[PDB]
Design a protein around this nucleic acid. Structure first.
Ligand SMILES: [K+]
Ligand SMILES: [K+]
Ligand SMILES: [K+]
Ligand SMILES: [Mg+2]
Ligand SMILES: [Mg+2]
Ligand SMILES: [Mg+2]
Ligand SMILES: [Mg+2]
Ligand SMILES: [Mg+2]
Ligand SMILES: [Mg+2]
Ligand SMILES: [Mg+2]
Ligand SMILES: [Mg+2]
Ligand SMILES: [Mg+2]
Ligand SMILES: [Mg+2]
Ligand SMILES: [Mg+2]
Ligand SMILES: [Mg+2]
Ligand SMILES: [Mg+2]
Ligand SMILES: [Mg+2]
Ligand SMILES: [Mg+2]
Ligand SMILES: [Mg+2]
Ligand SMILES: [Mg+2]
Ligand SMILES: [Mg+2]
Ligand SMILES: [Mg+2]
Ligand SMILES: [Mg+2]
Ligand SMILES: [Mg+2]
Ligand SMILES: [Mg+2]
Ligand SMILES: [Mg+2]
Ligand SMILES: [Mg+2]
Ligand SMILES: [Mg+2]
Ligand SMILES: [Mg+2]
Ligand SMILES: [Mg+2]
Ligand SMILES: [Mg+2]
Ligand SMILES: [Mg+2]
Ligand SMILES: [Mg+2]
Ligand SMILES: [Mg+2]
Ligand SMILES: [Mg+2]
Ligand SMILES: [Mg+2]
Ligand SMILES: [Mg+2]
Ligand SMILES: [Mg+2]
Ligand SMILES: [Mg+2]
Ligand SMILES: [Mg+2]
Lengths: 220, 178
RNA sequence: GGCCAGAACCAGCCCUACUGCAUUAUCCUGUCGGGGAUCAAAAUCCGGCGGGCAACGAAGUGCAAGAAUGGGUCUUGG
RNA sequence: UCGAACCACCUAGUAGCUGGUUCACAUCGAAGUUUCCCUCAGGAUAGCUGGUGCUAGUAGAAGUAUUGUGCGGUAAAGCAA
RNA sequence: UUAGGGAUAUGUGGCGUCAAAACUUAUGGGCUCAUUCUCGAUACGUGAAAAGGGUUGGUGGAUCCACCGGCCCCGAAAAUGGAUGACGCUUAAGCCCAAUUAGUGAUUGCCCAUUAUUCCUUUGGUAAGGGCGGAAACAAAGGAGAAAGUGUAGCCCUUCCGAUGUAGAUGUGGCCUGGAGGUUAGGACGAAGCUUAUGGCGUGAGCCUAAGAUGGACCGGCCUCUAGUGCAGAUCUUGGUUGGCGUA
RNA sequence: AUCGAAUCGCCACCUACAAGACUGGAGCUUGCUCCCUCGAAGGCGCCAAGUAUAUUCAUGAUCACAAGACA
RNA sequence: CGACGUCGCUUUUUGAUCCUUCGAUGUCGGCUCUUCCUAACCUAGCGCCGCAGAAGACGCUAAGGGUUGGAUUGUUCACCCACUGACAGGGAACGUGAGCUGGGUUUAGACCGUCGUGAGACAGGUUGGUUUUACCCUACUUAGCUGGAAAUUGCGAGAA
């Protein structure tokens, strides 16, 4: 929440709404480690990145094997005083954040700034839905990274069985979002068709040598 | 990729002396990375077979045997290798390639993969091109059917190096970062 | 102006592009035979006989001496 | 203050043992091995190092080859010697 | 294998992030799935035997049987929570081979040293050379210098080579302190002493200037001589101070 | 109101979804044939509100943060 | 169950060594209190016996929870009397002395036996024999005040 001083300064200066350049990444069907490595390098290079749908990441192997790995991680604990010991997060977004954090120099101010430049969500929240098209990382997608014969796990199920408590809520929110977006996209089809028709018709009205140039460069 | 071994013919003899005014002349086929290695293998074979050492011998010729035109062929390779546990083991294998050097390089890679045998523990006995009706293994024989055809599945196609990108729009070819 | 910058030229140095000579035969190409397969063929393969330069930027091969004369030097001095 | 009191002096008693030992650059640069010692936590002695040179500055050179000519009883081999 | 600095190129080791390099290279070939010290990536070295069995190879024999190899699995049990360095990796970022932009055209993919090559500067030589009879001419309103020399603010110039180091040896027109014989200066228009975001010089020991809104009467340089002549620590000596602490 | 600042693509056509061992549609002969919009392009934006013989730019004097920024 | 052989594991036994500590790291046992391991005594599930039933044996997963009261002895160990579902084995500087206790071992007093000419000796027996200091840092237990997202700044702007 902004302070009254900041609001007063903004009113005095008389400026418009400002949004920094932010890249939104849809992490569905992505390999956890490779995605984390790419994101960490980009953060160190100085980008602002927001990742969505963290509950649909993939890890190679079997769900039982990865759950056992997580339980082995959970065993680690400072015996003398556990309140000071390692803190084990169960949400998929927190899992991804920790994985990225392990690939950064987290004990320097540069590393902390890079880490704070990252925001992670489960599903797609309303404040991110309408901000523009999302991107993918081609060199970290399952259908080009895993051989299809081998089994794989989905991070959401593993988190749900090791202690995450909001899988059903996330599923219901995702279903509602998809239904709403589908209705909106079913609308405006007439507008899209009208624009396509107008572009098709403009060729007969534009000058002929311009038509020839477009044909020569393949945009006809 | 072109094969990493070349086909060398080495012709040599023992230096003449009073005891042996007219020594015998020997010819040797080898597959080596270069002619220095070829000469080394030739002298090793001469020492272990005819009791003639490189310090008392002459090399009359060391040339490269050119390959024939590229045609899909069946190659039979008779090869052998040494290991401490089992002594010497000799085997005969069949490959499909376009040249003798390619077949021998494939055989070396196969031996390294399936038996952990390195270059200097391997001796090549023979290599030849054989007809289709003389092939004994089905894994090789399946490739000369008259109506062979198959699709390409589970492909990983990478873009041209100048056009590769890091972040790309979801259902779009537009690049976002590089 | 004994300050800060840009460009030009000179000497030196550094890194580029531009390349000829030897070799090829277990090879190249026709024809006859058998051999294979087919639905009939061809092709992979083996003998003879006649010609040869695989020469497109031939070849993953053995040497190379191509600046009469392209850029860098806040890495050197004018 | 006692398995030999206290005070002053010989007395700054002796210690092969423990501790210390005050400015800067420059040219060079080791040894824990030999022999003797009531010698084994110490010395003397040769070796390794520094300084000073003398002598006609290529000399009487060499942790290396080649050729010629001597020496040897380990590795291996043998028990049918 | 090491004087003070640039540029270029390498060694050992590496090229998923941490972390520079294949923004995860190829238009290279095979093998491997590992459920609570959680496969593997451990040169030296810092875990594993006898004996046994999922896939992929090889010798023989029949008309399907024995044999023996690769990778994997069982055999394999300890004391704080933990270690291929961490995360992670399985169309590997694992193991065995093999390349350099790829059957297209012949020769060095890339990254990192107190090493190699080259350039600038210093210092010392078993150092190597040249010059040193002032050529001539020239007032303000082209300039200076030019020493027969171990060592300096080096007599001047050119050239080549070496440069780390405990115990230890030696050298220095090398630094600093109290006093003596000489010589040359300074001071009430302010000596010694003391203070410093006072700069300048020297590789350095140190030297010199500035300011004092400090002080109030002595003292600097150079050549020789001389010694009770240089401090961070000795459960060091003497004096003062100090956290514990407004605490027990 | 100090405040001078670094940042230099925007859209009410991307801003919905799923699958890479099967993507436009059929046919049997199951890898070939035929048909179609021909199966590797989000839309704009880069100096006349649009492709035409219209129109002010200096002396800010040869580089210098871009002396300008609500596209 | 398993001879004759043969391969391994462990550091809860004793040896072997002499790397650290001699201008000092308080040393046996018990009491108190916490935590860890599994080579599993009881409690939960399974499998198999030469398992008719009952009572048992030999295995596998499993360390979550339990594992006692007394006589003699300084004891650890041992043995006996009882109760019980059972009375398992170990580590933590042979856990734990500025936490206690001081019975043992190991000063100076004294007696006995054996040894010695003697002063004296004996991992032989016996009796008597000072247990010091926290108010410092950290750890732990409770108890108060208070800034801060560029984690104190930029005006550097991201709403589940
Ligand atoms: K914890
Ligand atoms: K024929
Ligand atoms: K022991
Ligand atoms: Mg013919
Ligand atoms: Mg008394
Ligand atoms: Mg004395
Ligand atoms: Mg005395
Ligand atoms: Mg002594
Ligand atoms: Mg001493
Ligand atoms: Mg030296
Ligand atoms: Mg004597
Ligand atoms: Mg001593
Ligand atoms: Mg012998
Ligand atoms: Mg013999
Ligand atoms: Mg005998
Ligand atoms: Mg890390
Ligand atoms: Mg990098
Ligand atoms: Mg096998
Ligand atoms: Mg690990
Ligand atoms: Mg491991
Ligand atoms: Mg590592
Ligand atoms: Mg020099
Ligand atoms: Mg030195
Ligand atoms: Mg005096
Ligand atoms: Mg000060
Ligand atoms: Mg003195
Ligand atoms: Mg002092
Ligand atoms: Mg500006
Ligand atoms: Mg001691
Ligand atoms: Mg001590
Ligand atoms: Mg203590
Ligand atoms: Mg003590
Ligand atoms: Mg113990
Ligand atoms: Mg005590
Ligand atoms: Mg204690
Ligand atoms: Mg007692
Ligand atoms: Mg007696
Ligand atoms: Mg007693
Ligand atoms: Mg702030
Ligand atoms: Mg702000």
């Amino acid at each position: 929440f902004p302070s009254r001083k900041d609001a007063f300064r903004a009113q005095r200066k008389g400026a418009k709404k400002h949004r920094p350049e932010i890249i939104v990444i849809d992490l569905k069907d992505h390999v956890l480690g490779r995605a984390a490595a790419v994101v960490a390098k980009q953060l160190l290079l100085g980008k602002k990145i927001t990742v969505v749908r963290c509950e649909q990441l993939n890890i190679a192997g079997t769900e039982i094997r990865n759950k056992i790995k997580y339980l082995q991680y959970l065993r680690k604990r400072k015996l003398t005083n556990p309140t000071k010991g390692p803190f084990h997060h169960r949400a998929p977004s927190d899992v991804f954040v920790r994985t990225v954090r392990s690939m950064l120099p987290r004990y320097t101010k540069r590393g902390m700034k890079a880490l704070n430049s990252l925001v992670a969500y489960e599903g797609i929240p309303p404040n991110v839905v309408r901000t523009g098209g999302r991107v993918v990382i081609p060199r970290a997608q399952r259908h080009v990274c895993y051989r299809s014969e081998r089994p794989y796990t989905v991070l959401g199920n593993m988190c749900k069985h090791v202690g995450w408590k909001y899988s059903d809520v996330v599923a219901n929110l995702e279903k509602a979002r998809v239904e709403k977006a589908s209705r909106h996209h079913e609308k405006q089809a007439k507008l899209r068709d009208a624009w396509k028709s107008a572009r098709k018709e403009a060729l007969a009205k534009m000058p002929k040598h311009n038509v020839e140039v477009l044909k020569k460069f393949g945009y006809a | 990729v072109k094969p990493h071994l070349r086909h060398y013919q080495v012709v040599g003899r023992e230096s003449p002396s009073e005891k042996n005014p007219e020594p015998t002349v020997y010819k040797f086929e080898v597959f080596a990375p270069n002619f220095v290695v070829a000469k080394s293998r030739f002298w090793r074979m001469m020492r272990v077979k005819n009791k003639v050492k490189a310090t008392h011998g002459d090399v009359l010729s060391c040339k490269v045997v050119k390959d024939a035109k590229l045609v899909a062929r069946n190659y039979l390779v008779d090869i052998a290798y040494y290991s401490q546990r089992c002594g010497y083991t000799r085997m005969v294998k069949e490959f499909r390639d376009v040249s003798k050097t390619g077949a021998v390089s494939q055989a070396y890679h196969d031996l390294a993969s399936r038996h952990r045998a390195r270059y200097h523990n391997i001796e090549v006995l023979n290599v030849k091109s054989i007809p289709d009706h003389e092939v004994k293994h089905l894994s090789i024989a399946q490739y000369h059917a008259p109506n062979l055809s198959f699709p390409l599945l589970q492909r990983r196609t990478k873009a041209t190096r100048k056009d590769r990108a890091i972040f790309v729009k979801k259902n779009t070819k537009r690049a976002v970062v590089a």
